[PDB]
Amino acid sequence: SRDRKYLARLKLPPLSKCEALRESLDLGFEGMCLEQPIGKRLFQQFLRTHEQHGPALQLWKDIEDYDTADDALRPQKAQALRAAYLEPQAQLFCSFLDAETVARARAGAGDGLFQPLLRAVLAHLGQAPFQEFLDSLYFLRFLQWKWLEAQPMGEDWFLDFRVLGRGGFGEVFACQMKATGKLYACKKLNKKRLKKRKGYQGAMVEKKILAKVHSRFIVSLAYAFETKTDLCLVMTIMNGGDIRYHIYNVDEDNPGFQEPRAIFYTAQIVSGLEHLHQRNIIYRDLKPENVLLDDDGNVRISDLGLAVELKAGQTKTKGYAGTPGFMAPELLLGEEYDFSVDYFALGVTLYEMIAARGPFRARGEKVENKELKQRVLEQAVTYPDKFSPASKDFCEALLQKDPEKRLGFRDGSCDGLRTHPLFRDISWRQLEAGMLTPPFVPDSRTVYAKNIAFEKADTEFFQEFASGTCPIPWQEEMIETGVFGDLNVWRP
Amino acid sequence: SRDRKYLARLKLPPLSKCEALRESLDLGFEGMCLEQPIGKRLFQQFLRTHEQHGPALQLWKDIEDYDTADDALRPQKAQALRAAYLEPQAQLFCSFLDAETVARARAGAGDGLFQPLLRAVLAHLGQAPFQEFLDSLYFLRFLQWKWLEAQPMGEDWFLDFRVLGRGGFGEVFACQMKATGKLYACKKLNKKRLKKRKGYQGAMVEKKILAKVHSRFIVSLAYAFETKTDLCLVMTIMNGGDIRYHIYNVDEDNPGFQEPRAIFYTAQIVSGLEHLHQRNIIYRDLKPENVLLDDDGNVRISDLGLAVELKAGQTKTKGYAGTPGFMAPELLLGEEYDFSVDYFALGVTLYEMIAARGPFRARGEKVENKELKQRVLEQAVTYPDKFSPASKDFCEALLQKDPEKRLGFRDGSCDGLRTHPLFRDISWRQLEAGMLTPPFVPDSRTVYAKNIAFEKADTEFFQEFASGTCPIPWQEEMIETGVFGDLNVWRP
Numbered sequence A, B: 001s002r003d004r005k006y007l008a009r010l011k012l013p014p015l016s017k018c019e020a021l022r023e024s025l026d027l028g029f030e031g032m033c034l035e036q037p038i039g040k041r042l043f044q045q046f047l048r049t050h051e052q053h054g055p056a057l058q059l060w061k062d063i064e065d066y067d068t069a070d071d072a073l074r075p076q077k078a079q080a081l082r083a084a085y086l087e088p089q090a091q092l093f094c095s096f097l098d099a100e101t102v103a104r105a106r107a108g109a110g111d112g113l114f115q116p117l118l119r120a121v122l123a124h125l126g127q128a129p130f131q132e133f134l135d136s137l138y139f140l141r142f143l144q145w146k147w148l149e150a151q152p153m154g155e156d157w158f159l160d161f162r163v164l165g166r167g168g169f170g171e172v173f174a175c176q177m178k179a180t181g182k183l184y185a186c187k188k189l190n191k192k193r194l195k196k197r198k199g200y201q202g203a204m205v206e207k208k209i210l211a212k213v214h215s216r217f218i219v220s221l222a223y224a225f226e227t228k229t230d231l232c233l234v235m236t237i238m239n240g241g242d243i244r245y246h247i248y249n250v251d252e253d254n255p256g257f258q259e260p261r262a263i264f265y266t267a268q269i270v271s272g273l274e275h276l277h278q279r280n281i282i283y284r285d286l287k288p289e290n291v292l293l294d295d296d297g298n299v300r301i302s303d304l305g306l307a308v309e310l311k312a313g314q315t316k317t318k319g320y321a322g323t324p325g326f327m328a329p330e331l332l333l334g335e336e337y338d339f340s341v342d343y344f345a346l347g348v349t350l351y352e353m354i355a356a357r358g359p360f361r362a363r364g365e366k367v368e369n370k371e372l373k374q375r376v377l378e379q380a381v382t383y384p385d386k387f388s389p390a391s392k393d394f395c396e397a398l399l400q401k402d403p404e405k406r407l408g409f410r411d412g413s414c415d416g417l418r419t420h421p422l423f424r425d426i427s428w429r430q431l432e433a434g435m436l437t438p439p440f441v442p443d444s445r446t447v448y449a450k451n452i453a454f455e456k457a458d459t460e461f462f463q464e465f466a467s468g469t470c471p472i473p474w475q476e477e478m479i480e481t482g483v484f485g486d487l488n489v490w491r492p
């Protein structure tokens, strides 16, 4: 799948070419060695080759391993961890730690056992070991990768191979990054039609939100660029398409998802919504057609074209935006609103997943926006026997017409909502890491995709929009596809 | 055999500690990338990881491989070389080369086919590829190894395990470098006895000569250091001891070497003598007791305590030095002399190897220095039937009493002497590289070794003498013993 010609442009530069990055990059520990996948990998390689750091690195790795392990393996793991690093006879005893820290980590039993230990380990690693890393070859090799990350990688680097859909949103293609073979979805916005529909500012707002979030539960933006005709956003491809299709069109006679599958998607959508709300962004368009499914069985939220970022000291907004059937009463009435709107839409979405109809409209019923609006404002929802008591109760809590009484985001988090009995069987710590096996695994639908004067103000906007490569996704791609391993070899 | 505790002091430094070496080292291409084993290895690793340099490196390696191959394999090698790098369809065609150079290298057939090609390859490598190496991680890793090479590695680093011999020369021990396990011979000079026998200047002259030669046919000096009681020279151990022992004491009834074995040692001693004479050094003590044998079957000259380096514009010297029986007439008469003296001693040594007696004295005969001196000056040598015509003729040529008529060093080399029919079966190019199988392989004799106020002028001399680690031998040891491979790993 890799193409030779583009793979050959991924060459590490001479060191002298990296002297300007060295001045201008943020070189803090958390930002470089914890948050950037290449930074982390290179930091850990430095630790592994410096025997004095062996215990700190192996303890670091063993805590991450513990944090994502199946419930049945945690006793034996927390025993092996303690014996290797914490007990007085431990072969890899971590003597940079406080006696208190070692004490507490040897006691304790519940969730987040070792989270305090981990903070201590990362705190230690950010002092002398990090300073030694900055004076090593490994740090320079990080600057070389960062120089590469910053090079031009525009339309030429992507091969379009299938049309996924066209409409007012632009056109979306399945495409392949030529050097690595990685598959992506590319959304293309026609520059002329965009100017004439005065959509510059909306498009920019969407791109910005996508660039600044980084969640496994939200489609990722990996590249933003321009062509002569289009502005282009290269993002995670979700091979299953939208979940609405799956609710109705897979078992046509008996549509709807089984509860475990519905619950698992809800949990992933809640994780996505929390990520946005913690960054002061309101999504405003949650519905089944904008929740996408991949062929591992996981979902992400997509279509961030109606989303708003709240400004400094802003807790509410106004503005009529959404999809009829999913907009909360407070929005339909023209009031100010906050993150609450997305929780009502969540309620509606879960209802549909289980019932294969919405709470206000029978399957296939045709309702004009006025008749729908008055149903959302006045109609009490009923629940068929198809709903368990926990799914009914969760749904009632989200469908509260008064946002003051609705379940949602409280005290900076969704942790309140995570405690509802609906989610009693979800291991959030494995969900967060992508390590919880989905209750259902679908087939890919990529084969159902069919084959393939501006002013200076227009120019400057396009070029600002075309900000290029996003660091974190690019580092992921390089590691995942094996390119990092191949180009980072010291002696074959 | 490696010891953990000393191995642990071989740690590569932080980069900032190498900034002063970077200013003060000679960083020329020939000196760093061709002559220093670690420099070369790191240069070749840089070439191997930069695909554009692949052809130059593989051609470089294939020429060295050709230069040392058994005679029967050279046709097929020179064919495979031409097809890979030189013909218009060659997969690894070397397009930095001139069309003339490629032409000549495709023609030709004799000895030194590709020597002009090799000069062209190394000339090319010393331009842009070398400049790219200096701007790479590989060059910095070279500075790190050079910093290590310069660290204190005195008496503590060596474990003495056997006494090889004691006398007026000091004491010689078999010893082991603790970090690497490498075995060496260590010669120790007692500081008090040395001062009192006024031997400071002689000892210094010897150390200096050993440090500045680098030949596979001369014992190598690897470390020079002091203790509270001794000055110490750590050098190649030669496990067989001196060849005099082997002439007489292995087949006691029928002593002497077979001609092929004698010829092979002579060829190696000539290679050693040429190395000295090309550096304007006269050995002055060649004899069987100072030619040492190792258990691969190869010999080196040792005991450089009488050697002289001629000064600028000096072609002759005077001074009565040597061993009775091996000193040339011109020296015995008190005349000026040059490199010719060592060729007479060669004559004597070869005579003894074949006859198991000297040319002037029967086996076991006792002759006072006066009666011997007059025999060397007046007696015509005779040759038993034991001598082939070629060995007789070579011996006659070296035993000429008139140094003007003696075979020797002419026009900067021994190439004249190399053409004598005696050496018709020696492949000099494999001999020079250590790649000619010896006609005889002996057993090691290490088990016959038995177990274990100064002025400020004295102080300054000892510390000048104790110059520490010699770069080239140290880099060899690191590579040979596997330490280089182990510490130079980038990702285990």
Ligand SMILES: COc1cc2c(cc1Nc1nc(Nc3ccsc3C(N)=O)c3cc[nH]c3n1)N(C(=O)CN(C)C)CCC2(C)C
Residues within 6 Å of the ligand: A163, A164, A165, A166, A169, A172, A174, A185, A219, A235, A236, A237, A238, A239, A240, A241, A242, A289, A292, A302, A303, A445, A446, A448, A449
């Ligand atoms: C192999 O992948 C697919 C195949 C299909 C779809 C979507 C995808 N995948 C996909 N589709 C995307 N968006 C998309 C596809 C059709 S319209 C559309 C959009 N308006 O964003 C995105 C945006 C980020 N990542 C994406 N991944 N389709 C849909 O999900 C249609 N719904 C959005 C309404 C079109 C149907 C097929 C099977 C081709």
Ligand SMILES: COc1cc2c(cc1Nc1nc(Nc3ccsc3C(N)=O)c3cc[nH]c3n1)N(C(=O)CN(C)C)CCC2(C)C
Residues within 6 Å of the ligand: B163, B164, B165, B166, B169, B172, B174, B185, B219, B235, B236, B237, B238, B239, B240, B241, B242, B289, B292, B302, B303, B445, B446, B448, B449
């Ligand atoms: C396992 O190694 C040996 C063992 C023995 C000898 C020499 C060596 N090896 C040796 N011997 C060396 N020198 C040496 C050993 C005894 S005296 C002496 C010297 N005066 O330099 C050197 C100097 C550089 N490298 C050396 N290697 N011996 C001799 O070669 C004695 N002749 C020089 C006269 C002593 C005998 C044994 C077997 C112990």
Ligand SMILES: [Cl-]
Residues within 6 Å of the ligand: A044, A045, A048
């Ligand atoms: Cl690692």
Ligand SMILES: [Cl-]
Residues within 6 Å of the ligand: A135, A136, A137, A138, B012
């Ligand atoms: Cl390093």
Ligand SMILES: [Cl-]
Residues within 6 Å of the ligand: A256, A257, A258, A261, A440
């Ligand atoms: Cl299902």
Ligand SMILES: [Cl-]
Residues within 6 Å of the ligand: A325, A357, A358, A359, A360, A361
């Ligand atoms: Cl509805």
Ligand SMILES: [Cl-]
Residues within 6 Å of the ligand: A359, A360, A361, A362
């Ligand atoms: Cl209804």
Ligand SMILES: [Cl-]
Residues within 6 Å of the ligand: A111, A426, A427, A428, A429, A430
């Ligand atoms: Cl959990």
Ligand SMILES: [Cl-]
Residues within 6 Å of the ligand: B044, B045, B048
């Ligand atoms: Cl190599």
Ligand SMILES: [Cl-]
Residues within 6 Å of the ligand: A012, B135, B136, B137, B138
């Ligand atoms: Cl490099």
Ligand SMILES: [Cl-]
Residues within 6 Å of the ligand: B256, B257, B258, B261, B440
């Ligand atoms: Cl023999």
Ligand SMILES: [Cl-]
Residues within 6 Å of the ligand: B325, B357, B358, B359, B360, B361
């Ligand atoms: Cl004699």
Ligand SMILES: [Cl-]
Residues within 6 Å of the ligand: B359, B360, B361, B362
């Ligand atoms: Cl005689």
Ligand SMILES: [Cl-]
Residues within 6 Å of the ligand: B111, B426, B427, B428, B429, B430
């Ligand atoms: Cl030859």
